[PDB]
């Protein structure tokens, strides 16, 4: 069975401006020691239409991994607005934290993200070209989706 399970993800500094970093406090249990690296990544879904609009904001390595319960802080810069299809910029999208071992993704933690104007005028009459300096990002942290995949450890 799985050698690593996620205990918690704390979503910090949320809601926040669109342009502010994502900040996650990741806590996990390792039941059997891993000599090789866990690779963690944060992926922004730029568009529901296609995976081609995914942005990998950042990637971090953790290893070797002792048995026990552990925590680290994973921060990543906000996505590049220019690469987001304009119709999908405002409103709901998804951000993902994934973990990979020996090149196989064994866990995917997703959150819904609402990008909203707080300015009533903008809310009412949003510009054709979104103003990202006016968008607030609200990560829906009370509703994580944790998907596990069986992988071959060793």
């Amino acid at each position: 069975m799985a050698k690593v399970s996620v205990l918690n993800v704390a979503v910090l500094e949320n809601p926040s401006p669109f342009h502010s970093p994502f900040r996650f406090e990741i806590s996990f249990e390792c039941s059997e020691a891993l000599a090789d690296d866990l690779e963690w990544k944060i992926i922004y879904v730029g568009s529901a239409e296609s995976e081609e609009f995914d942005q990998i904001l950042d990637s971090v390595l953790v290893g070797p991994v002792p048995a026990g319960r552990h925590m680290f802080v994973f921060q990543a810069d906000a996505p590049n607005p220019s690469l987001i299809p304009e119709t999908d910029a405002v409103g709901v999208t998804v951000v993902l934290i994934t973990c990979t071992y020996h090149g196989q993704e064994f866990i995917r933690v997703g959150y819904y993200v609402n990008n909203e104007y707080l300015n009533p005028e903008l809310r009412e009459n949003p510009p054709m070209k979104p103003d990202f300096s006016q968008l607030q990002r609200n990560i829906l942290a009370s509703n994580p989706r944790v998907t596990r995949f069986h992988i071959n450890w060793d």
């Binding site: 399970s5 996620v6 205990l7 509703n143 994580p144 989706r145 944790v146 998907t147 995949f149 069986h150």
Partner: protein, 86 residues
Amino acid sequence: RHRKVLRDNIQGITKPAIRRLARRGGVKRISGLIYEETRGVLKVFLENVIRDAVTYTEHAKRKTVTAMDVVYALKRQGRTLYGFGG
């Protein structure tokens, strides 16, 4: 005048199934576009699982897909939870 013999028409999943599924999931209202979308999604899911299942069946050198082959394929699909362990 002129009586017609009927032909079996079961093809794919009709709309009420999709409404039933959506209601199970707490959905109160759907666009008409939901219908085709749901079919598409189901078709992909089934296409993947079945593929893997048949492969298991091919490795057993039998022409019959068993329950276990399916169980294994579903294990390959990934399991989604609504919160964190611990």
